[PDB]
Structures are given as structure tokens and as C-alpha cells.
Amino acid sequence: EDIVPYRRYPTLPAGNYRASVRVNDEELISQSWSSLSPTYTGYQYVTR
Amino acid sequence: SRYFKVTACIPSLKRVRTGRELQNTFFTKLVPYENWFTEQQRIQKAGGKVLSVKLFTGVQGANTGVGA
Amino acid sequence: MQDAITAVINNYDVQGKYLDGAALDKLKAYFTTGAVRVRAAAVISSNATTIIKEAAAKALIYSDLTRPGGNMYTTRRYAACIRDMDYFLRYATYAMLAGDPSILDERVLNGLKETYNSLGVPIAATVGGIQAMKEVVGGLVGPDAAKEASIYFDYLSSGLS
Amino acid sequence: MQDAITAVINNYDVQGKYLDGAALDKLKAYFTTGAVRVRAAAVISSNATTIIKEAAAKALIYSDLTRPGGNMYTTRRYAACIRDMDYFLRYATYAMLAGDPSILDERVLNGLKETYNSLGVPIAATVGGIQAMKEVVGGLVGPDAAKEASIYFDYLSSGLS
Amino acid sequence: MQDAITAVINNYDVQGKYLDGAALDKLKAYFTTGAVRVRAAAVISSNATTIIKEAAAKALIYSDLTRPGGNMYTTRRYAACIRDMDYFLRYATYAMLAGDPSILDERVLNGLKETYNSLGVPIAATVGGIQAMKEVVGGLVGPDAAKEASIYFDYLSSGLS
Amino acid sequence: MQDAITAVINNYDVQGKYLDGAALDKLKAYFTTGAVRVRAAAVISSNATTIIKEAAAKALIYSDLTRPGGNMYTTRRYAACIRDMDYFLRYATYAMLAGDPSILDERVLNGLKETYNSLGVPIAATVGGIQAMKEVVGGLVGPDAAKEASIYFDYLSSGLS
Amino acid sequence: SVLTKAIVNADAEARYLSPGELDRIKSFVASGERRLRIAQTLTEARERIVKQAGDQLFQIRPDVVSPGGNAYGEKMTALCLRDLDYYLRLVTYGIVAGDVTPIEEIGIIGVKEMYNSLQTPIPAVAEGVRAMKNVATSLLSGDDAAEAGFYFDYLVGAMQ
Amino acid sequence: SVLTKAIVNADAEARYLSPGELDRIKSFVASGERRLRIAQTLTEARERIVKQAGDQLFQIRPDVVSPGGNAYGEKMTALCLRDLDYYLRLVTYGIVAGDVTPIEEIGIIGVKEMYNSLQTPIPAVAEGVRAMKNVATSLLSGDDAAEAGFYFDYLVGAMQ
Amino acid sequence: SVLTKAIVNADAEARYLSPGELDRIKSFVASGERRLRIAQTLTEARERIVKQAGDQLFQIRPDVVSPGGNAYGEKMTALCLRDLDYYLRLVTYGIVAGDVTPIEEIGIIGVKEMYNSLQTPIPAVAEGVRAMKNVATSLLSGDDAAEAGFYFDYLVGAMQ
Amino acid sequence: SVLTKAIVNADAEARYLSPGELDRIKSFVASGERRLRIAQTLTEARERIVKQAGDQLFQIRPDVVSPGGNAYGEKMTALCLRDLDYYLRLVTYGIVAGDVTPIEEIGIIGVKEMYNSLQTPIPAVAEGVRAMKNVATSLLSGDDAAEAGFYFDYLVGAMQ
Amino acid sequence: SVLTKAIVNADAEARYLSPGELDRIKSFVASGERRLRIAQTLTEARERIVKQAGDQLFQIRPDVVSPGGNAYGEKMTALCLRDLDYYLRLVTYGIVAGDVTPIEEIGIIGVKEMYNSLQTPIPAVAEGVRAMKNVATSLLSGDDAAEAGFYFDYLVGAMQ
Amino acid sequence: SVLTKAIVNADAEARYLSPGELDRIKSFVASGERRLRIAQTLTEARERIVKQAGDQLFQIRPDVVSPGGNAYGEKMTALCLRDLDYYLRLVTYGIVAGDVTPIEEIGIIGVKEMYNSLQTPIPAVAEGVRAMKNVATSLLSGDDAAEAGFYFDYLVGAMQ
């Protein structure tokens, strides 16, 4: 009832430790949720 | 839109957990009506004691405006 | 993560060595700079928002980056970018307190280069945003702390490029 | 919750009655005032912040309430109080759109009297904060809507006392 | 996701352009077909179950697929397969209402090819299940809507192959 | 929670008073005992298990409590009981360091009387377990600290009865 | 209603109503008198409608009214038309509310479990509802008949 | 849009669109040509509108354009009107979409954080938007002026 | 305090205080006598610090004491210095405890919402606090002035 | 260290270090040359504190070096005196770090499980660890002996 | 029992017992009289089993009944055999129940902690139960001795 | 293939093949079934590999899709992905044969001269191929991904 959830890396189910290491704290969130204005991508640079 | 307001006492009986746990076992919480059937079963299958229940939110009448 | 005091212990533990004279000298070299690190962190923390504002003003905005077609166009993305800036500033302040860059690898750089490639986030422009915050920081913290703060901003920026 | 229209439907459903002339007259009495309710909500929503500020200024601050020993002393509690005020305003706007106070019971009044007794929150002072927002609202929304907005503020305030 | 209308808005937003004549013509081309899309959705929704049953009957069951060794053998897997079928039908109905296939990519196709390879789910057989539902749909919705419904079933099926 | 020092700060904050002279006497006392409270706290910590293996022996076991029908019968319940004992000891050590019992109310006593009534846990027997640990503690910590440790064990035990 | 639905979404996101939400309340309320007329006409012909649905049903499924049929017999048929009267009533409620909230809580959520217990064939109840659409729709102008028809097709949809 | 909003709620509850949701799509699409006309008129007068908003703003707040003001100077004022041009554009988008999805992602979510950084006084940006409402609204018929006005008051609302 | 902070973290891992989270407490106890002394010194000159802070503030930002300024007038200025007196008090509390703790609960959490309502310009409150640092710091030895200065810069930081 | 413990709290609350946290780093580092010097006395006498501990340990509990004892024999004893050498080493590490992070990861987390497997009697081991305190402490000035003693009592605390 | 363990699965899935579940109850109950005989034989020889277990234990590990031993003395010994009597009793319960539910709640959950606190070697103690099995296994005919033996080996299994 | 290569070396010497050369061919035959399978797998995802390769390429080298870039524009980009589709095809051929053979004749001998004429930057074509390796390799088991990877790195090598 009262523990705020935290990341886990659990040992047991088999394969789950490495999957868990990868899903959380190894691979972040990509993809912008909204679909409103695509980011153009031809402009990496900020010269001035 | 109907929330019950239950109260229980569940006593851990399988492990002797070692830190904290006071609020885990004696607590008051409104739980919405959709889920209260399962929460009660879960309290009962852990040897919990369901001390009190209330309607709290909803009218104890029904049909329109209940299952929202 | 590790810090200078902790790194000395784990670096010796793997060799099973008591701390010896060489170890004790390293730890002294950290402790002797410690008070200065603290003062510098209090300046950065309390000027956080102004550092980002002045760093963005010198290195990001008034540009094609903030115009339609630019990656920090839209209030959404402008907010995400200066949010990022705050991360960098905040973590660099951790690294400098710890006297160890390991936290910048574990919690900031790991996967970030490719994350930015995948979203289209301009890397070179982000580095300039880092090196502008360093410039501001080095003025605010003074002779005592300037070189020590600076290195973890430089760690961050060669971590992306 | 229920509004004017579902109040009638559920009152007939429990009798299993098709809507008859008396029912149809009630629903008309709602629909015929509907456009005015909408306009009034748009005034309240868009003046929300000013209504709270003028209501607090007439009925809460410049007082012992905001001084040490007072319940709205500390930025924490001042923030909690005007947060509450926003709830009241917002829900009263819902009740008035719905033309039914049932939402004010289900989502605002239930347990609130005792919650305030338990924290020490001054009830009489909160009612004045409600009746001051009503005063401001009744000016802003005009002849069309004044009486209809007003009643759900009065519902709120006799719900606490 | 995006629909016809937001497809245009976002294409112009990235250029920071107010909508011009070409844009306005595109949006008209959507609005002018809108009423027909709605009627078609109401036919599909209300015949959902019959479309799946007739599509399965023409393209899936009475076969090795439903026999031991087949992927839709067992009540478990038969249920999973017609569950899937309902997804396709339902989402294609969304795509056709929106006049944009983007939802079929975001919420249906992404990773699905490999998911099916990993479970052993026969791709070619699933496509026939899609193109059979299209056949049924095109009869039920009539001249008005046949071509427009059809394309999002074709989008789905070339998304797997 | 609060300690000696924050007890004073919050008592003055509600009056909006800067700290005045008598208040400052009170803070002087806490810094005077700060050495002994720390040395004393350490001793308890490493000797904890020894300490707990004397309070049970003189107030709980070799009795009907540990026999069938008794509340500390079964390895499960014996474990739960000495687990509890460790809580009491540990928190009393916090209260004594803080020089304030408020933590014993917030995190230990609140609801505990009824929790014990609901499980059947014998209250009087638990108090003896508290007052036996106090007896042991007062020997181990010496003249310097005996009275100060003792009071928070007495706070605990009149909190249950 | 349209009101309830709009508001619940508003309150759940802790916000005032959107321009969109306000617009639909306005369009909805403008159709008030028309929606009330649609309910009146159908209320006024309820006994005729249930009956013609009931004839259309027993031709299409003479079995339901056959030895091993759920509605076999005079009083197993009487209850069947009463259920058809129930659903027409709920359809009038839905039309005046402008959505299904009321229709749903009263007669679709739980309907699978109810009828499975009674062993009533659900899809032939859906047919009885189509039959009522056909009759009711022949007593309404083209525009009003469509507006009514959406609510009939919803019930047909929910029993599925 | 109205479409996006309806659908997202549909998909999230794993269901086909409601009669209500279908009705609003129908009423919305019927207003298509009108909404397109409202956007055209305002697009056609964009340069006039920002300016008159800009005059109304600097009378009401001559300070913003004063020594310690965010918009003090010729090019701090040029950027300020450009921001007013941005928001009018987003308002035309919103009107043709029939809701705020686009307006919101592009120019309100994150706007507090952006302007706080730049130290721009948010409530005087809200005033600049009211000023644009006043001008734009004087170039539209009563009915179209109201429909437009909802979207202006939304932006004014979101900067709050 | 330093005590409260250490302890709260301790109970969090079901653990005993370790040899580090004891050393800080010991440092604080020695520091506390000096800390108590600094607070007393600050308390003695409170009226001078506030008043001279208030002059330093209104030179640097005359706009707040001008027609459209939050602190414009004799009693809008009186309340402004009273708020400066409040924050100096909280700064003495923070110094004495050794941890900021209580000051946060008393005067920064909720402060954005409070002042936004009153329409008080937050960043000029931060300036009033810098002004107090300057005055207070000139009444303390180098070492004590720095120790005090951290707490002034914290408040300046939190109003941000 | 104190840092590893004094930063982890910072990062976990997403913030820069507190004045308190900065102060303790300050006080800690000032005690560096001296802490280094207490850990050099103990390496000098590394094998002589250990030998002396061994004797005290076996008087207070010999049975371990007897027929059915875990440490019975010359190489079962070599291992025991070796474990005592391990823990003295970790104690020197802890003293120079100013907290237990290193001591903990290297030799207490997992120690119950390790020794339970070996069925070394763990509680005898705590007494053995305690003996080293007595010897080491007799080679240090009063002030340095206390500072060292905290780390010995920690292991004694964990260990059991 | 088998019932308690299994019904629990029924209730948790909201259903009546499976053919499988019913079958195992039937096979289980058929094996009743035999299990009752196994418990009787062992109950009938309890005093012999305990003492001969106690001799077998102290040969294999005597040190416990020696100066620094947990069971040293007449009344420290009166307790060790009493604990052996406890576990034999629980083993008879387990055999008649056909699983460990009762054995577990009464004497393993919380034990290891319990034994550990008192500082008794847990492996010393499992010898003793393993020794009790031998004396007891020998007062039963070959078929009943095996049936009893499973429950002795369970306790031996749990205590470790 | 492996066959062609072995034979050509045999015939050049004008002597029948060896009996350990009858070893590489044997390995290849077993390998070929696996090799054929890998090619089929690659063929199935061709459109995804090309497209995602093309995104990975233009991020890493945006200059080719810029004013003075060989692949600047929609149809100069379309041909560029088509060339990426060509090389993936040749990579499937190479894998299946077991020897690179045909791919060389089809797409590396003459490739410098072709692309120099078209003015295509060769080393950025090599990058497009690395990008395809990355995608293709994520759709294959570790062992098969390596076997495939050799042929990708060959093409990367030959454009050099």
C-alpha cells in the first residue's frame, strides 16, 4: 500500500536482469508524443 | 463517481518483514467503487480484517449517474 | 557513482592494498580543495537560472535554432532545451563537488549522443550551450574555483562530440 | 454526478416512465437558459485569477489571518488557501453549467467540514471568501446570469456552515 | 497521431506559415468527403462481428490453419486471431475517419511484423484476413465510401508484407 | 518530526519572532550534550544484539508468552516481537539524539495501541519489554547519559498504556 | 448527457471547458426542441412500434418462439416484448440526452451476464432492436429518423 | 482537431465512436467553409491586426517599452510584434481545427518557462492577445467574430 | 536542522546512523554556538538592515515604487519592508539550526503562488534580499559574514 | 566517503548541495592530514595488532581452536588471523574516507550469507573484531583513539 | 492441508473445484488411515525418539553441553530436548495434513531468526532432528517408517 | 561462390581438387542452408532496413542533403536510397553463395569511376552501408548477425 515505486534490476526470472538493465537506465525515451510540428533535421548548427 | 471508504487491518503472516510497515497494515483509504470488489477480496485472502466500509461519495440509491 | 574519496578506496580494494602513502597523498589533494568546491556550488546553485539565461542568449537564441525549422522552435522544445541545460549545469556541479566525472558518464552521457541523433537534436549547438554556461560560471565563482568547475563542463562537451 | 437533464431522466427511470409533459416542461426550462450559462462560464474562466485576488482582498488578507498565528500565514498555507478558492470557483462554474448542485456534494462538500475542523481551517472565514467571489462574479457576468451563478456559491457556503 | 487537417497544420507550422490557398484547398477536399466517412463508420461498427465472421469464413477457417499444427488451432489462439481481426477493422475505421494512415503506423504496424515472426504467426494468412474484411466492408458501405475505406485496409496489408 | 532546535524555531516562527535571549539559553544546552549523545549512540548500536538478548530474557521468554497459546509462540511471532523490540530501541535512540519525543509519536505510537488490540498483542507485556531494555541501556551508557536515554523509553511505555 | 460527458473530461483534467466542448453544448442545446419532438413521436407510438418489431422478429426467427427457444410460449413472449418496450424507452432517453450515459448504465453494462444467465440469445435481441428502428423510423421525417437511428444502432452495437 | 480529440478518447477506451462524437464531427465539418473564411479574412489582414494590437498594448503598458521593460527599444519591440504575429497565426490554425491541440503544443505548453527565462512579463502578453481580439473581431461578422473570439480568449486563458 | 535532515534520511534505510552521519552533527554542535551568536548579532541590527536594504532596493529598482508598481505608496512600501523583515528573521533561523529546513516551509514553498496572486515582482524581492546581504554582511567578521551569506544566497536562489 | 554519501542525497533530490552539506565537506577535508596520520599508525602495526588480537580472541572463546571448532588447526587458524587482517585493513580505509561506503561494499554486505555457509561462528568473530580495537587503541593518542574507535564499533555493529 | 492449499486456488479464480482438484482430494483422503497410523506409532514412542535423538546429537556435536555451550547445564539441556519434542510433534501434524502449512506457520517462519538470536548453531540443531528420525524410524515396520520419514526429512529440510 | 573460387584455383593448376579442399566446400554446404535463411530474413525487412539506414545516414552526414550535396533534393535522395537498396540486395547474394564473388562484378569493380563521374562522395556511401549493417544486424541472432556483418564490412572496405 505505501512504498513509492522504484527501479528494480531484479535477479530472478531469467533474462530479466539484463532486460531490465536495458529498459530502464540504458535506453531512454525517444519519440515526441505530440504530433504537431515535425522537427526538421537539416539544421544541427548554431553559428553566429 | 462512487467511492467507498473502507478500513482494514491486514497482518502479515508469511514473512516477518523487517523495516517499517505500520501503515501498510492499519489504514483508511477511499477506493473507487469499480475496484472495491477486488480490494476486498485481496484483503480477505491475506487474512485481513475489514473493520469498516461507507458509501462516502455516491448516493445509495442508483441507475443514472452511477456507472460513470 | 564514485567521488575522489571513494575512487581511492575502490581502486585500492581491487588490488587488496591498504591505503598507503601514495593513496593518502591523493586523498589530501582532494580534502585540501574541498571548502572551495562547496562555495563554488552555492554560487552556481543560487545563480542557476541567470547562468542558463546568459548562456542561451550568447549561444542559442536570436537565431535559426529558435525559428520555424529550428530544433528549439515551439515553446515545447524551447522548454525541453533549457530543461536539458539545467541538467548539465546541475550535474556538472555534482561532478565538481565529487571531484570525479564518473557521474557525468553514468547518468548523463550514456546513450545521449544517439538519443540526440534519433530526435534530430543538434549536437554542435548543444556543446556551445555547454561552453557558454562554463564561461558564465567561471566569472561568478572566481580564481579559487574557476579551473575546477570548468573541467566538468569540458568533460560534458567532449562526451557529445 | 447529475445535471438538470439527467436529474429528470433518473427520476423517471426509477419509476420506469417515459418522459411526460411535466418532465418535458422541466427540460425546456433548462434548455431555454442554456446559452446564458455558457457565456457566464467564459467570463468566470477568463477572469478566474482576478476574481480570487479581489475576493481575497475584500475578505481574507490585510488581517490576523495572514499574520503569525493565522491559518493563512506562511507562503505554503497562503498558496493552499487560494488553491482552494480556485476549486470553489471552478466547481461552482461546473454546477451552474449543469444546472444541478449534485457535483458540489460529490466532489467538494463530502467530508470537507471535518477536514477543516481537523486541520484547524477557519470555516467562517472560508465562507466569506466564497461570498466575496460571488459578489465579484455577479458584477462580471451581468443581469442575464447573476442569479443563476450566485446560487451555487450559496450552495457551497451553507454546505460548510 | 495526425488526421487530414493536423497533417496540413504541422506541415505549415514547421515552416511557420499561415495557411495559404494550397493548404485551404487540401482541407476543403477533406471536409467535402466528411459526412460520407461518418456514415461508413456507423455501418462498419454496427456490422463489426459479421464482417469478421464472413472474412474468417472466406480466408481463414475450414483449413490447415485451424487444424492441429496450425496457428489458429486451440480456442486460445482462435480467440487471439479474431481479437486481432477486430483491432484491424476498428483501427482502419479510425484511419478512414481521420483521412490519414498515421495511426495505423503508430498504434498497429510498429514492431508487428517481427512480433509475428517471433510467435510464428503466419503473415500471408493474416493479410488475406485483412483483404477479406475489406471485400465485405466495400459491399456494406456502398459507392459513396467504398474506395476510401478500402485504402486503409490496403495500408495495413502492405505494412505486414 | 522535530528536534530540540526545530521545536524552538517553529514555536517562534508561528509568532514571527526572531530568536530572543531565553530561547538562546535553550540552544546552548543542546550543544553541551552533543558530545555525550553521540558517543552514547554508538555504543548502543554495536552492542545492540547483546542488549536485546537481555531484555527479552528478563521480561518476556521462559514464560507462558512463549508457550502454546502465548502471543510469542511460533518462530514467526517470536521473530515479529523481537523485530518490534529493535524498532523501539532504534527510535528511542533517535528521540534521545534529537532531544525531542515527537518522532516517537509520528512514526511509532500513532495507531499502535489499537493495532495491538486488533492482533491480540499483549500491551502490558510489551511495556515490560520496553522497561527492561531501558534498565540494560542505563547500565551500558553510564552516569553522563542514563537519565536522558531513559525518558524516551518511558515516553514509549506510557504511550501504550 | 453531452453536458455530463464534457464536464467529466474537464474536471478529470482539472480545467475549464474547451472552445470545442462549449461549441457542442451550444449545438446540442439548439437541437433541444427537435430532439424533444423525436422522443414525443416515438413515445406516442410505443405500443405500435414494439408490436411491429415483434412481428418482424418472429418471422426472421420463428425458432426463438419454438420448443427449445428462449421466448417459447405466451408469457415467454410477453416478457420478450416487455424487454423490447424497455429498450425503446431507453432510446428516447438517449436521444434527449445526446449521448448514451443513461442508456448504458441502465441496460447494456451487465446485459451479457444477465441474458447469459437467463440463456437468452443476445444476437436475436439485437434483431428485435433493428426491427424497432425500422418501425420507429417510418414515423419520423428523414432528418429526425437519422438522428434517432444512431441511438438504435448503438444498442444493436452494444449487444455484441 | 475535433477529429483527433474524438478518436483519441475512442482508442483509449478501446471502442468505436459514440453517437455524440459522430454528431460533433458532423456539425464541425458543416462549419468547414465558414471556419475557412474566418481564417482567410484574418490571414488577409495580419499586418494591420498585429500593429493595432501593438498600439493598444503600448498605451496600456508604456513601461514594457520603458528603461527597465522587456520590450524596451526598437528591436526589443520588433521581436515583440513578431510574437504577436506568431500567436495570431496559431489562432487561425485553432479556428480551422476546431480545438487547441495544435495551438497548445506549438505555443502554450512550455510558454511559462520560455518567457520566465527571457524575463518577459506574461500577463502583458495576454494583453497583447486581447488587443488582437479587438482588432480581428472588427473585421468579422457578429457570428464569425464570436467563433473567432473563443480561440483568442483561450490563449489569454492559457497564459495564466 | 542538520539533525532533522540526517535522521530523516536514516530512518529511510532502516539503518542506524553511521560514522559519517554523526561527524556532521558534531561539526554542527561546535558550529551552533558560533551560529547562535551570528543570529543574535543579526537580530540586534534588524531595523537598520531592513531600512538600508529598502533604500538600496528602491534606487536599484525605482519602478516598484512608481505609478504601476506593486510597492507604490507609503503603505504599499510599509508592507514591502515588513516582508524584508520577515525574510531576515527566517535567515537567522536558518543559520542557527545549521540547516535551512524550517525557513523553506515558512517562506519559500508556496511563495511563487502567493506573490503571483498579489502580483508582486518576484525577482525584485530577490534583489531586496541581496541588499540585506550587503548590509548584514558589513556587521560581521569575514568568517561569520560568509557563513551568513550562504543563507542569504539560498533565499535569493529559491525565489527563482 | 562523506562525499559519496553527501552527494547521493543531492542527486536523488535533483539538486545542488546544501549549505550544510558544503560545510561538512569543509570540516571533513580540514581533518585530512590528521586522518591520514591515524591511518598510518595502524599500518605500521598491522601485523602486530592482529597477532595480539588473535590471542585475546581465543582466551575469551577458545573452543574455535579445538577438535570440533571452525578454526581448528594451523591453516584453519591462518585463515582466521587473515580475516582479522582483512577487517583491520578495511578499518584504515574507513577512517581515511570518513564513512563506511568502502568498508560496507567490501566486507559487511553479504557477510552473513558468506559466514553462514562456512559455518564460521560469526558471533565469535564480532568479539575477535572487538579485541583489535583494544590493541589498536593502545597505540593512539586519546583523541585519535576515539576517532578510530567509531569505525571498529561500526564493524562490530554490522557484523552481528 | 491439500484442501487448504487447493481450495484457495479455486476461490482466487472465483470457481468450483476442477476434476483434477477433486481427484487429488480423493486420492489424498484414501491415503488417511495409513498416515494416521504413522502419526500414532511416532506419538507412541515420542520420549524414546527425543532422548535417543539427543544422545545421537551430542556425540556428533557435544561442545553445546560444555562450559561455553548454549545447552550447557541441566536446565539448558531440558530446553534443547524440549525443542526436539516440539519439532517431532509438528512432524506428526504435517504427516496427517499431507503438507507443511501447519509445520511452517508454527515452527519455521521466524525460526532461523529465532535460533540466530539465541546463538544456537542451526546446523547443530538439524542433526538432532535428523537423529530423532533414526530412533523413530526404528519403532515402525518398514512401510510406516518410510511414510514417517518424509516428515522428519522435511523439518531437516526447512531448518536450513 | 566458395565453389567457383576453389575450382578456378584448381583448374589454373590443371590438377583435380584436393581432399581438405573438399573441406571448405563441405563446410559451405552445411553453412548454405543457414546462409540461405539469413538472406531470406534480410530480404523480408528490406524496406525498413533501407529507410532506417537513410535516416541514420543523413543525421551523421547532413551535408550530402544540403545545397551543394550530391543527394540534395527529393529525387536526388530517392536515387540515393535506391542505391542503398541495391547494395543490401548484393549483400544477400554474397551471404548465400558463401563467397562474395558476383557482388564484386556487380557493384564494386568500376564503382570508383562511376561515382567520381556522378560526383558522389564515396566515403558517405560507405557510411550508408554501415548504417544498414546496424539495422540488419538488429534483426538477426548473434551468430547470424556476425556472419552477415562480414559481408557488410567487405562492401565498406571495397569503397576505399
Ligand SMILES: CCC1=C(C)/C(=C/C2=NC(=C\c3[nH]c(/C=C4\NC(=O)[C@H](C)[C@H]4CC)c(C)c3CCC(=O)O)/C(CCC(=O)O)=C2C)NC1=O
Ligand atoms: C516502525 C514502527 C512500527 C512498529 C513498532 C510496528 C509494530 C507491528 N507489530 C506487528 C505484529 C506483532 N507484534 C508482536 C509483538 C509482540 N508479541 C508479544 O507477545 C510481545 C508482547 C511483543 C514483543 C515484545 C507479535 C507477536 C506480532 C504478530 C501478530 C500476528 O501474528 O499477526 C505488526 C503487524 C504487521 C506485522 O506482523 O509485521 C506491526 C505493524 N509496525 C511498525 O511499522
Ligand SMILES: CCC1=C(C)/C(=C/C2=NC(=C\c3[nH]c(/C=C4\NC(=O)[C@H](C)[C@H]4CC)c(C)c3CCC(=O)O)/C(CCC(=O)O)=C2C)NC1=O
Ligand atoms: C510560436 C511559439 C513561439 C513563441 C511565442 C516564441 C517567442 C520568443 N520570443 C522571444 C523574445 C522576445 N519576446 C518579446 C516579447 C514581448 N516583450 C514584452 O515586453 C511583451 C510582453 C511581449 C510582446 C507582446 C521580447 C521583448 C523579446 C526579446 C527578449 C530578449 O531578447 O531578451 C524569443 C527569443 C528570440 C528568438 O530567438 O526568436 C522566442 C523564441 N518562440 C516560439 O517558438
Ligand SMILES: CCC1=C(C)/C(=C/C2=NC(=C\c3[nH]c(/C=C4\NC(=O)[C@H](C)[C@H]4CC)c(C)c3CCC(=O)O)/C(CCC(=O)O)=C2C)NC1=O
Ligand atoms: C538526467 C539526464 C538527462 C538528459 C540530459 C536528457 C535529455 C533529453 N533531451 C530530450 C529531448 C530534447 N532535447 C532538446 C535539446 C535542445 N534543443 C536544441 O535545439 C538545443 C541544441 C538543445 C538545448 C541546448 C530538444 C529540443 C528536445 C525535444 C525533441 C523532441 O521534440 O522530441 C529527451 C527526450 C525525452 C524528452 O523530450 O524529455 C531526453 C531524454 N534526459 C535525461 O534523462
Ligand SMILES: CCC1=C(C)/C(=C/C2=NC(=C\c3[nH]c(/C=C4\NC(=O)[C@H](C)[C@H]4CC)c(C)c3CCC(=O)O)/C(CCC(=O)O)=C2C)NC1=O
Ligand atoms: C514569512 C512568510 C511570509 C511572507 C514573505 C508573506 C508576505 C506577504 N506580503 C504581502 C503583501 C505585499 N508585499 C509587498 C512586497 C513588495 N512589493 C514590491 O514591489 C517588492 C518586490 C516587495 C518588497 C521587497 C507589497 C507591495 C504588498 C502589498 C500588495 C497588495 O496589498 O496588493 C501579504 C498580504 C498582506 C498581508 O495580509 O500581510 C503577505 C501575506 N506572508 C508570509 O506569511
Ligand SMILES: CCC1=C(C)/C(=C/C2=NC(=C\c3[nH]c(/C=C4\NC(=O)[C@H](C)[C@H]4CC)c(C)c3CCC(=O)O)/C(CCC(=O)O)=C2C)NC1=O
Ligand atoms: C480442440 C479444440 C477445438 C474445438 C472444440 C474447435 C471447434 C470448431 N468448431 C467449428 C465449427 C462448428 N461447430 C459446431 C458445433 C455445434 N453446433 C451446435 O449447435 C452444437 C451446440 C455443437 C455440436 C455439439 C457447428 C454447427 C459448426 C459450424 C459453424 C459454422 O460453420 O458457422 C470450427 C470452425 C470450422 C473449422 O474450421 O474447423 C472450429 C475451429 N476447434 C478447436 O481447435
Ligand SMILES: CCC1=C(C)/C(=C/C2=NC(=C\c3[nH]c(/C=C4\NC(=O)[C@H](C)[C@H]4CC)c(C)c3CCC(=O)O)/C(CCC(=O)O)=C2C)NC1=O
Ligand atoms: C514450536 C515452535 C517453537 C520452537 C522450536 C521454540 C524454541 C525455543 N527455544 C528456546 C531456548 C533454547 N533452545 C535451545 C536449543 C538448542 N541448543 C542447542 O545448542 C541445540 C542446537 C538446540 C537443541 C537441539 C537452548 C540451548 C535454549 C536455551 C537458550 C537460552 O536460554 O539462552 C526458547 C526460549 C525459552 C522459552 O521461553 O521457551 C524458545 C521459545 N519456541 C517455539 O514456539
Ligand SMILES: CCC1=C(C)/C(=C/C2=NC(=C\c3[nH]c(/C=C4\NC(=O)[C@H](C)[C@H]4CC)c(C)c3CCC(=O)O)/C(CCC(=O)O)=C2C)NC1=O
Ligand atoms: C574482503 C571480503 C572477504 C572475506 C572476509 C573473505 C573470506 C574467505 N574466507 C575463506 C576461508 C576461511 N576463513 C576462515 C576463518 C575463520 N575460521 C574460524 O574458525 C574463525 C571464526 C575465522 C577466523 C577469525 C577459515 C578457517 C577458512 C578455511 C575454511 C575452508 O577452507 O573450508 C575463503 C575461502 C578461501 C579462499 O579462497 O580465499 C574466503 C573467500 N573473502 C572475501 O572476499
